[PDB]
Design a protein around this ligand. Structure first.
Ligand code: SF4
Lengths: 175, 99, 98, 115, 70, 114, 74, 71, 156, 318
């Protein structure tokens, strides 16, 4: 029955990600972020991405583990609040949900929405690859760049990471 | 400023990442190879304002290669007229799965 | 127009407004910066896969390694802020008065 | 969506384990079992107190080396192109830069404190 | 000695045996006896697609063996 | 904008070589060896024009070359070619080391007799 | 001496140093380059008839062009 | 051979689908029957809706999404 | 009587599943704790009977009160006891715990642990022998053999 | 029949976990000079079945401020992700023939860590907080080294596809081109699997079960089953990843028997390492892990980069 499945997974992503960015307690935010990263990996995987979504799932998720470690270490309230606790938190969460359901309504019962661009309402099996007899598998050769042609780029990226390491050590050392 | 020590030293370190029709790593095409070859053959020795006076048509052909916006417009109009005629009940068509 | 682009731009704008308005936790501000990173990631990656422009799939890996080291820098700054105070609230930052 | 089918079956299995835990066996007499237990005595407050931690550099260290894991992980697709020299050169340069940053923060006791 | 620990290991190893033999039985039960045509890349998927196109019943594993030469 | 035209169904009547994909992958060495000399003109048409709907006549020619190749390999030597491709058919995706004796017997057939 | 200050670390530096040094003196990088050049992923296209090129042959059976035989030949 | 088979198949879908369009839209005004989207005249590569439109769910689902999450 | 026959079968099943394991908590105040540690001896096993040491109180099946309960300890004893899975049993091990014993007088001794918790299975001794402790666990299992829980529930 | 294959994957893992609990208790008894469960049932077996029933009975129940959503969603995601790890595992032909499996292994292992993390936060009694941050530290340590050693051992022969890996395991096992890398990886699997307190600081006697201080008497089975599925999980992944058998071609039963025997005797070796050694230390884990494994792993990675150019052993990578 389903053919809008990337749009559907994107709606689940927008739900979890608005509830993420509505700022509850950051541990609930990280719950929202792991849900959002998982379904975003699902979006880019089911679009046709081979590995890069599972890659960013891994990387971005270990980053969220570090963010959990610091939000537990540094500062929490006497009682941490959840989405449905406060006036403002519940209000922003439900109005983000209302924007989501309202755009689903004004796409599914309409032709197009032009808030910033003419968005075409139908799922993205169009436009799409017409079965290229490749066997070179585009993302594999794509990340097989940065090494053959990518000379200067990995130089400045690794140099930025080395500078990042010495910068973090000297900021904590600056006492 | 826009310094091209890039050009002066004679090292192409940043030009290979520039557009389509550059060297994708094995000899493959992109989705819109030919339309960029059209637009770049139109707009080389041109002073970037008569590229929009004169090379407008071919660049818009490239933009409609990328987004396929009018194609989606036409296809959506066909689907919605299909829906209203099958809602009316005028010749529910059999052409798929048969003749 | 590939309708999924609408919801991803919607998620970007919501993550931006969440980055801008915030109650007390700078941790949550860094967290929304991480989310905005993810939004630009997914939009650029779906762009590159629609275009089959697979020579330049450098945008995802390099954008997120750089923005993640930015987030690491912010986390160390939050370590220093919570070291030289009790908590990391937006209040008790109102010194160095303009 | 076949792995989504497997995720669905495991979600149904996990929820049926929840319901067979809750609703089947016996009654639910509460009102002192819910009290927070530490080791035998009622403590002050609860958790969510500001719990100042030992390691500061180590989590950021994990983050940045996970980022260089991200740059290094396309090694098999590195190993098949006609530019063997740039391949081996930038591969050795990336791992050597990782070892250089590690060597700096190893020699400057960035791990020798509250580990 | 270990004379009595062997039945627990053996029963638990037959418990580990049954996913492999069950999975192989289901694969050979599902596709006309044929070991399953795993499709790594889009070349293999397009070849499998014309394979299931030339069958008639929309199942590739029939594979119409050397008889539509005519 | 501009108009386009398409070939009607008068032109699109070429009988497919409706054998399975596994045997078609299996005999591919000698499929490219004896036949597939004239189809490089088809390939040169296809690259130098980058216009399918135009090179369809040599598409008909390569399709009849393939059907003539299969007619020649069916009418003459031999029968255990059927055993050979159903031996390469089985092992999941095709590995050319799963079945070597039957490759050698089919090769000895077609070599010593054709 | 220089060995057992941190011995597994110095052993790691030794295998690291031979990993740095040893591909310079290497009699097989040329074989890796030849094999990696001679695996075509895409179609070797034909070309226009010729201006009588006495190369790039008429049939790939003919060994006029660049063939390979050293796979079975060690 | 696979190249020519794909050619005949996509030309068959294009001819039959423009006949489908010329049958199904021939009453609403505007709408030339088979004009190009583009200002030039070349063989544009299709989009899997110009080929696979209105094939009633299962066919387009097994065509455009099979390799992604099956086998 | 198919209904009461099924009730009897299922009640016998769940009672057997109860009397199988009985993993305790290692409470152990005084030298009856040392006797518990020598009930964890190779010459007298408890893992033959599924009696397995599980230190967290919220999953232990019984509570072996062993050692001299005092008034300074007794609020900690009951505030451990009151949070537990809903079937709960008490094995009072040793003359200190099950009636005061040698310190039955002499302030800051609760005169036996009967004044704090319900106590099912008494094993008396100073110390009880490990053989007697395992016999107390077996008779606890026979108390589990005579529950008739679901029979009472259905004929209610 | 795909639902039937789902059932023949979800059913044998349960019996695997239950009789693994039995073999834990019995091997641990015969190790510790005593005897295990011998009286009850046939020799032990129906007492782990009775343990499943016994822990079903115990009526789970919530703590004071323990927010119920996060609370009951932690061990459910634990057991769900601990099942869905076993999707691409090439028992002769796996469930989903993934084009990439080992990075999926790392992803779902990190998710198991998050499940332990969310349970330790939501249990909310300060000891679950202590144990949760101990888990966070030992995962700061053990997703760098295991992932990079993985990258090394897949660089020479694997290329992410486990069917091509079982093609590679024909002439020699991959224990011989990388044995010390394999030993460091076995240490890392024993750490990340969070069994064998040689490299585990969560179920100590210094704490009281920081992952399960007061969760609830019901889902202790869920969390318990998740960790022992982690044990079988990483031992099967070790048994596939390094060594094994050139299988009987198009014949599954011989390969399945030999793989099961190798994997389960290696799991007995794992349990036998648990039964032997004292517990470990926080700062000693950071010091030992980084300053002993990490430059040696980098050296093995660079030498396994250069070895396909030192000896032309570049893979035939599809
Ligand atoms: S009863 Fe005897 S052995 Fe037991 S705690 Fe009291 S003094 Fe010690």
């Amino acid at each position: 029955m389903m053919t809008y499945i990337v749009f559907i997974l994107s709606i689940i992503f927008v739900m979890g990600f608005v509830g993420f960015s509505s700022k509850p307690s950051p541990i609930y935010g990280g719950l929202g972020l792991i849900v959002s990263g998982g379904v975003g990996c699902g979006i880019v995987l089911n679009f046709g991405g081979s590995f890069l979504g599972l890659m960013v799932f891994l990387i971005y998720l270990g980053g969220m583990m570090v963010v959990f470690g610091y939000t537990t270490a540094m500062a929490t309230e006497q009682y941490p609040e959840v989405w449905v606790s406060n006036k403002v938190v519940l209000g922003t969460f439900i109005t983000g949900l209302l924007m989501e359901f309202l755009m689903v309504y004004y796409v599914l019962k309409d032709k197009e929405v032009e808030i910033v661009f003419k968005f075409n309402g139908m799922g993205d099996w169009v436009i799409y690859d017409t079965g290229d007899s490749g066997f070179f598998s585009e993302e594999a050769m794509g990340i097989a760049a940065l090494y053959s042609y990518g000379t200067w780029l990995v130089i400045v990226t690794g140099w930025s990471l080395l500078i990042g390491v010495v910068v973090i050590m000297e900021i904590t050392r600056g006492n | 400023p826009f310094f091209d020590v890039q050009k002066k030293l004679g090292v192409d370190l940043d030009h290979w990442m520039t557009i389509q029709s550059a060297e994708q790593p094995h000899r493959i095409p992109a989705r819109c190879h030919a339309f960029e070859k059209e637009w770049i053959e139109c707009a080389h020795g041109i002073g970037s304002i008569r590229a929009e006076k004169e090379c407008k048509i071919e660049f818009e052909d490239f933009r409609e290669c990328l987004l396929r916006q009018k194609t989606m417009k036409r296809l959506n109009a066909i689907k919605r007229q299909r829906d209203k005629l099958i809602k009316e009940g005028k010749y529910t068509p059999p052409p798929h799965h048969s003749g | 127009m590939s309708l999924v682009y609408m919801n991803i731009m919607m998620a970007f704008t919501v993550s931006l407004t969440g980055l801008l308005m915030y109650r007390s936790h700078l941790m949550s501000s860094l967290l929304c910066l991480e989310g905005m990173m993810l939004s630009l990631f997914i939009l650029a990656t779906l762009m590159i896969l629609n275009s089959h422009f697979t020579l330049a799939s450098m945008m995802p890996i390099i954008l997120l390694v750089f923005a993640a080291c930015e987030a690491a820098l912010g986390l160390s700054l939050l370590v220093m802020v919570s070291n030289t105070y009790g908590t990391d609230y937006v209040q008790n930052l109102n010194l160095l008065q303009c | 969506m076949n792995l989504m089918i497997t995720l669905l079956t495991n979600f149904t299995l996990a929820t049926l384990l929840v319901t067979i835990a809750f609703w089947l066996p016996q009654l639910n007499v509460y009102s002192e079992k819910t009290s927070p237990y530490e080791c035998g005595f009622d403590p002050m407050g609860s958790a969510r107190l500001p719990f100042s931690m030992k390691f500061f550099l180590v989590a950021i260290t994990f983050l940045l080396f996970d980022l260089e894991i991200a740059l290094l992980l396309p090694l098999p697709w590195a190993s098949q192109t006609t530019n063997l020299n740039t391949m081996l050169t930038m591969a050795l340069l990336l791992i050597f830069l990782l070892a250089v940053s590690l060597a700096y923060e190893w020699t400057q006791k960035g791990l020798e404190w509250t580990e | 000695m270990w004379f009595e620990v062997l039945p627990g290991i053996a029963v638990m190893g037959v418990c580990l045996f049954i996913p492999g033999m069950a999975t192989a039985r289901i694969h050979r039960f599902s596709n006309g006896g044929r070991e399953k045509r795993v499709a790594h890349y889009s070349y293999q998927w397009y070849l499998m697609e014309r394979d299931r196109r030339v069958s008639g019943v929309n199942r590739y594993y029939v594979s119409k063996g050397l008889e539509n030469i005519d | 904008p501009g108009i386009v035209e398409l070939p009607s169904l008068e032109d699109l009547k070429v009988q497919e070589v409706k054998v399975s994909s596994s045997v078609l992958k299996a005999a591919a060495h000698h499929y490219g060896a004896q036949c597939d000399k004239p189809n490089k003109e088809f390939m040169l048409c296809r690259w130098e024009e980058k216009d399918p709907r135009r090179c369809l006549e040599e598409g008909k020619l390569v399709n009849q070359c393939a059907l003539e190749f299969f007619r020649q390999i069916k009418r003459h030597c031999a029968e255990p070619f059927t055993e050979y491709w159903t031996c390469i058919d089985y092992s999941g995706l095709q590995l050319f080391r799963r079945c070597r004796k039957e490759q050698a017997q089919f090769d000895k057939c077609v070599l010593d007799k054709l | 001496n220089v060995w057992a200050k941190e011995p597994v670390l110095v052993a790691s530096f030794a295998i690291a140093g031979l990993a740095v040094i040893l591909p310079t003196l290497s009699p097989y990088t040329k074989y890796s380059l030849m094999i990696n050049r001679a695996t075509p992923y895409n179609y070797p296209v034909p070309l226009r008839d010729d201006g009588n090129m006495p190369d790039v042959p008429s049939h790939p059976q003919d060994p006029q062009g660049p063939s390979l035989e050293w796979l079975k030949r060690l | 051979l696979l190249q020519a088979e794909k050619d005949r198949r996509v030309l068959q879908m294009l001819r039959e689908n423009l006949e489908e369009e010329a049958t199904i839209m021939k009453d609403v005004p505007g709408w030339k029957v088979g004009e190009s989207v583009f200002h030039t005249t070349r063989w544009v590569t299709p989009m899997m809706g110009e080929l696979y439109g209105l094939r009633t769910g299962e066919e387009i689902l097994s065509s455009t999404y099979g390799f992604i999450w099956y086998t | 009587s198919r209904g009461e026959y099924v009730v009897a079968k299922l009640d016998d099943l769940i009672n057997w599943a109860r009397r199988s394991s009985l993993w305790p908590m290692t409470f152990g105040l005084a030298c009856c704790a040392v006797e518990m540690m020598h009930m964890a001896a190779p010459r007298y096993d408890m893992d033959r009977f599924g009696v397995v040491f599980r230190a967290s109180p919220r999953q232990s099946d019984v509570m072996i009160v062993a050692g001299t309960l005092t008034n300074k300890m007794a609020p900690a004893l009951r505030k451990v006891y009151d949070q537990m899975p809903e079937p709960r049993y008490v094995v009072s091990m040793g003359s200190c715990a099950n009636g005061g014993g040698y310190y039955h007088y002499s302030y800051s001794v609760v005169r036996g642990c009967d004044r704090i918790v319900p106590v099912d299975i008494y094993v008396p001794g100073c110390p009880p022998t490990a053989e007697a402790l395992l016999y107390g666990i077996l008779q606890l299992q026979k108390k589990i053999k005579r529950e008739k829980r679901l029979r009472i529930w259905y004929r209610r | 029949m795909f639902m039937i294959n789902v059932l023949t994957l979800i059913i044998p893992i349960l019996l695997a976990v239950a009789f693994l609990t039995l073999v834990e208790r019995k091997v641990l008894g015969y190790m510790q000079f005593r005897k295990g469960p011998n009286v009850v049932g046939p020799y032990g077996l129906l007492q782990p079945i009775a343990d499943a029933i016994k822990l079903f009975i115990k009526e789970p129940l919530r703590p004071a401020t323990s927010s119920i959503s996060m609370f009951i969603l932690a061990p459910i995601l634990a057991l769900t992700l601990a099942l869905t790890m076993w999707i691409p595992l090439p028992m002769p032909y796996p469930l989903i023939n993934m084009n990439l499996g080992v990075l999926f292994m790392l992803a779902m292992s990190s998710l198991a860590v998050y499940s332990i993390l969310w349970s330790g936060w939501a249990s909310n009694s300060k000891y679950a907080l202590i144990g949760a941050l101990r888990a966070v530290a030992q995962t700061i340590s053990y997703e760098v080294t295991l992932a990079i050693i993985l990258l090394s051992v897949l660089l020479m022969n694997g290329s992410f596809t486990l069917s091509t890996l079982i093609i590679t395991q024909e002439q020699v096992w991959l224990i011989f081109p990388a044995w010390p890398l394999a030993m460091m990886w076995f240490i890392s699997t024993l750490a990340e699997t969070n069994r064998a307190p040689f490299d585990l600081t969560e179920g100590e006697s210094e704490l009281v079960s920081g992952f399960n201080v007061e969760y609830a008497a019901g889902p202790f089975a869920l969390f318990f089953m998740a960790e022992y599925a982690n044990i079988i999980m990483m031992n099967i992944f070790t048994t596939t990843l390094f060594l094994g058998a050139f299988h009987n071609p198009y014949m599954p039963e011989l390969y399945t028997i030999n793989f099961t025997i190798k994997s389960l005797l290696l799991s007995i070796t794992f349990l036998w390492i648990r039964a032997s050694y004292p517990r470990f230390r926080y700062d000693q884990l950071m010091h030992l892990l980084w300053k002993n494994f990490l430059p040696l792993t980098l050296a093995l990675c660079m030498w396994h980069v250069s070895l396909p150019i030192l000896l032309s052993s570049i893979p035939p990578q599809t």
